[PDB]
Amino acid sequence: RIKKISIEGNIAAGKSTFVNILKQLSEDWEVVPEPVARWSNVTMSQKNGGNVLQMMYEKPERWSFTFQTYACLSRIRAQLASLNGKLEKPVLFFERSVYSDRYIFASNLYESESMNETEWTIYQDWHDWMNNQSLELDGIIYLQATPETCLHRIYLRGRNEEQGIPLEYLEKLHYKHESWLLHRTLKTNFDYLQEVPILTLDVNEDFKDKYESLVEKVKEFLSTL
Amino acid sequence: RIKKISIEGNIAAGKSTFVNILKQLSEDWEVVPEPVARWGGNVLQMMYEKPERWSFTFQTYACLSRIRAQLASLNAEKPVLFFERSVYSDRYIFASNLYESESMNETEWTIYQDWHDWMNNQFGQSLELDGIIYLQATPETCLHRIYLRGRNEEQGIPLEYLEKLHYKHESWLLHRTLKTNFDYLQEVPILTLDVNEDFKDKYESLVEKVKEFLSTL
Ligand SMILES: O=c1ccn([C@@H]2O[C@H](COP(=O)(O)OP(=O)(O)O)[C@@H](O)[C@H]2O)c(=O)[nH]1
Ligand SMILES: O=c1ccn([C@@H]2O[C@H](COP(=O)(O)OP(=O)(O)O)[C@@H](O)[C@H]2O)c(=O)[nH]1
Ligand SMILES: Nc1ncnc2c1ncn2[C@H]1C[C@H](O)[C@@H](CO)O1
Ligand SMILES: Nc1ncnc2c1ncn2[C@H]1C[C@H](O)[C@@H](CO)O1
């Protein structure tokens, strides 16, 4: 019986670092990266995904729908094989969810006009459908940082394509993160999700070698599920 | 147990007509129309407006809309389910062509073929065919039946597009040259009927043949 936690948050808040911290604290703990993050920097999968990322960055109003499609189906399959292959008290740690795909990223491209009524309408259906047709999660852990901490972090990361991402986007993605995971205001069609329990974690301070409290906070919340 | 038979055919080759014609003949005989037929209506219209913009998006909605429709009907004594085209049609006819005519790029094309390879590796689950019936018509023929059908946005279909498509049908369903990542398919028997002659009020010969074919599977 595998528990299922999603680790969520804005660009450069510290998810993969956190995910690769818990990684070696237990062998009942496994981690599934987010596919997009491997296409992000530096095989047929990587080829395509990196092709798709650059195009979405260069002309989002043309490539948002295809990007969202490939990136969600990639997380989906990446997530399926981690039931297969590995894991007494097993937890799987997901690096973002198919819900972030949709209520954070996909949603923001509609409202910014990068996907049109048809595009976004056809995405909501596929999504609803592809997901109803094993990965529903036991909990969500929210690593909350500011747009500014987020903005500084991507600069410390130094990714080519990401240096141009401006504070105003991050500022939109923070708001949706907030409405979903803290005031629990955002409303959806995965109903269980309205009451999956969530833990919010302040990672504005650097925790790269001072993380015991955050982890005790994780261990405690696992205990409550 | 429900036998699954796809009616393949170029545009307006007779497909919708023969399949309904069939629909009345037997208790044991039902049909799943092509969802693009009823069209989807914007995505199809955007498809005719600017195909190098919408080809990828349509193909995905088109094909998944057919998988849903077919599954739905996947739930008589000697059951036979007839489909109107199929997910091989969607990939080796249409997406293939559309990649071939640069309305999709390699990324697009690779990303489609992977998603089709996967959307249907969980879903051969009675969408896998028992036979194919190829309504072979000449392109010339199909071009008149499009004026026959007298359909708005379908009026300007060239002469040459319809050519592209039949050469692809014939390589797939008559010469059997064409190769795919469903090894089963190359097994599967095909039946090949000529439909240039009208048949609305003269189909017994046709249906007789259908009947021999089903009888041997
Ligand atoms: O406590 C931390 C967490 C991370 N980072 C740095 O911020 C950048 C982005 O973090 P990460 O890739 O883990 O963020 P994610 O997008 O996965 O949330 C990397 O250079 C990290 O080393 C940091 O300076 N202090
Ligand atoms: O023997 C026939 C077969 C078809 N049609 C007509 O050809 C047009 C297109 O037929 P259908 O929708 O069956 O073509 P499909 O696209 O479904 O192959 C319609 O007006 C049919 O009435 C016809 O006149 N004689
Ligand atoms: N669904 C998605 N998942 C992950 N990233 C997304 C997604 N949509 C857009 N992006 C943008 C954020 C970064 O610029 C870049 C790398 O994450 O892609
Ligand atoms: N998968 C598909 N199924 C049926 N039609 C397709 C498909 N892809 C493109 N087309 C084009 C042909 C017609 O002009 C128009 C209506 O059939 O759509």
Residue entry with tokens 């009675």: B126
- A55 Cβ below 6 A of ligand 3: no
Q: Is the peptide bond before A42 cis (omega within 30 degrees of 0)?
A: yes
- Alpha-carbon gap, residue A218 to A25, rounded angstroms: 12
Containing A6, the helix (H) or strand (E) segment is strand A3-8
Residue A48 vs residues A43, A123, B93, B204: alpha-carbon distances, Å: 8, 20, 23, 51
Resolution in angstroms comes to 1.8
The residues of A that are catalytic are 95
**Residues ≥6 apart with Cβ < 8 Å to A121:** none
Superfamily of domain B1-217: P-loop containing nucleotide triphosphate hydrolases (3.40.50.300)
Q: Whose CA is nearest to atom 12 of ligand 2?
A: B16
Q: Whose CA is nearest to atom 1 of ligand 2?
A: B198
| Cβ-contact B66, B122 below 8 angstroms | no
| Cβ-contact A7, A18 below 8 angstroms | yes
**Residues ≥6 apart with Cβ < 8 Å to A31:** A19, A20, A22, A23, A92, A93, A95
Q: Two tokens at B97? A: 């062509």
Q: In 3-state terms, what secondary structure has residue B179? A: coil
Backbone conformation region of residue B171, classed left if phi is above 0, alpha if psi is from -120 to 50, else beta: alpha
- Alpha-carbon gap, residue A110 to B23, rounded angstroms: 43
Helices and strands, number each (H, E), in chain B? 11, 5
DSSP result, A51-105: HHHHHHHH-HHHHHHHHHHHHHHHHHHHHHHHHHS-----EEEEES-HHHIIIII
- B65 Cβ below 6 A of ligand 2: no
Amino acid at position A170, single letter: L
- Alpha-carbon gap, residue A45 to A21, rounded angstroms: 26
| Cβ-contact B143, B162 below 8 angstroms | yes
Q: In 3-state terms, what secondary structure has residue A112? A: coil
Long-range pairs for B175-179: beta carbons < 8 A, 24 or more residues apart: B178/B92
**Dihedral of alpha carbons B54, B59, B61, B62, sign:** positive
Of the ligands numbered here, which is closest to the C-alpha atom of A56? 3
Instruction: Please judge whether B115 and A77 are an interchain contact, meaning their C-beta atoms are less than 8 angstroms apart.
Output: no
Classify residue A115 by its DSSP letter.
Answer: S
Instruction: Please judge whether B43 and A126 are an interchain contact, meaning their C-beta atoms are less than 8 angstroms apart.
Output: no
Edge-to-edge order in the sheet of strand A3-8: A29-32, A91-95, A3-8, A139-144, A198-202
Torsion of CA A95, A99, A103, A109, to 10 degrees: 70
Q: Two tokens at B14? A: 């007779």
The alpha-carbon gap from A123 to the nearest alpha carbon of chain B, in Å, equals 9
**B64: chain A residues, CB-CB within 8 Å:** 126, 129
Rounded (5°) CA angle A6-A8-A11: 145
Which chain B residue's Cα is nearest to A71? B111
Q: In 3-state terms, what secondary structure has residue B74? A: coil
Q: In 3-state terms, what secondary structure has residue A158? A: coil
- CB-nearest partner of A65 from B57, B114, B122: B57
Q: Two tokens at B51? A: 């195909």
| Cβ-contact A16, A93 below 8 angstroms | no
- Alpha-carbon gap, residue A201 to B79, rounded angstroms: 58
The secondary structure of B19-70, three-state, reads HHHHHCCCCCEEEECCHHHHCCHHHHHHHHHCHHHHHHHHHHHHHHHHHHHH
Cα atoms in the Cβ-side hemisphere of radius 13 Å centred on A74: 25
Reference A177, options A41, A62, A6; nearest CA is A6
Reference A203, options A142, A143, A140; nearest CA is A143
Backbone conformation region of residue A95, classed left if phi is above 0, alpha if psi is from -120 to 50, else beta: beta
- Alpha-carbon gap, residue A162 to A117, rounded angstroms: 28
- Alpha-carbon gap, residue A80 to A74, rounded angstroms: 10
- Alpha-carbon gap, residue A187 to B148, rounded angstroms: 50
- B202 Cβ below 6 A of ligand 2: no
| Cβ-contact A215, A208 below 8 angstroms | no
Counted residue by residue, chain A has a size of 225
- Alpha-carbon gap, residue A90 to A96, rounded angstroms: 18
Catalytic residue among B30, B84, B153, B204: B84
- Alpha-carbon gap, residue B26 to B23, rounded angstroms: 7
Is residue B84 flagged as an active site residue? yes
Q: In 3-state terms, what secondary structure has residue A143? A: strand
Residue A224 vs residues A190, A194, A213: alpha-carbon distances, Å: 22, 17, 17
Of the ligands numbered here, which is closest to the C-alpha atom of A31? 1
Residue B62 phi/psi, 5-degree rounding, is -60, -65
Taking residue B179's Cβ as centre, other Cβ atoms within 10 Å add up to 11
- Alpha-carbon gap, residue B139 to B52, rounded angstroms: 24
Instruction: Report which ligand 1 atom has the smallest distance to the Cα of A143.
Output: 18
| Cβ-contact B165, B100 below 8 angstroms | no
**A126: chain B residues, CB-CB within 8 Å:** 60-61, 64
Edge-to-edge order in the sheet of strand B80-84: B29-32, B80-84, B3-9, B131-136, B190-194
List of E strands, chain B: 3-9, 29-32, 80-84, 131-136, 190-194
- Alpha-carbon gap, residue B25 to A154, rounded angstroms: 67
| Architecture of the CATH domain A1-225 | 3-Layer(aba) Sandwich (3.40)
DSSP result, A160-214: GGGTT--HHHHHHHHHHHHHHHTS--S--S-GGGGS--EEEEE-SS--TT--HHH
Instruction: Report which ligand 1 atom has the smallest distance to the Cα of A10.
Output: 18
Instruction: Please judge whether B111 and A69 are an interchain contact, meaning their C-beta atoms are less than 8 angstroms apart.
Output: yes
Probe residue for ligand 1, chosen from A157, A170, A173 as the CB with the greatest number of ligand atoms within 8 Å: A157
- A36 Cβ below 6 A of ligand 3: yes
Q: In 3-state terms, what secondary structure has residue A23? A: helix
Residue entry with tokens 């037997």: B26
β-strands A198-202, A139-144 pairing: parallel
